[PDB]
Design a protein around this nucleic acid. Sequence first.
RNA 1: GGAAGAGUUCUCUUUUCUUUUUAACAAACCACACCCUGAAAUCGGUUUAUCCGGAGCUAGGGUAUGGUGUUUGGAA
Length: 96
Amino acid sequence: DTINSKLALTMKSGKYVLGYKSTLKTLRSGKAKLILIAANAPPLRKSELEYYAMLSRCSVHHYSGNNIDLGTACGKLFRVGVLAVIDAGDSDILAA
RNA sequence: GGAAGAGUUCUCUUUUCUUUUUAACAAACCACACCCUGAAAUCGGUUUAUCCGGAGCUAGGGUAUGGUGUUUGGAA
């Protein structure tokens, strides 16, 4: 409950990308500080994003719900399997 | 409509009826899936029938599949 609230606060203050290859690009640039993975993501998709996160020294979180739940928590109306939070803004999702 | 012949026709009737072809094959060219840039809702594109889109839309540039069509050759 704390984390999703921090995610919502990030999305109005921190800078974000909600998409598969945009997250790949941000991880490649190394800017993305934390990546959220939907639980229903493919085992292949999870692994290479995890590999990129470990290469870029990026914190990784597994959002327990499916991608529809991540979209509802994210507040938008499109499914997001994987997203990147690059700055926390007013929120403090990076530390906790 | 054009042409050819056969009509009909005191007169009316540019009119009545009939015909007017290009094969297999061989050449050059001629539009659905995917890729690249892209990151989107103020929701856009779109079917006769709303389908798809952060599992990446619209848009731009490409790639392939050529159903076909164009020009001939065959062929006068």
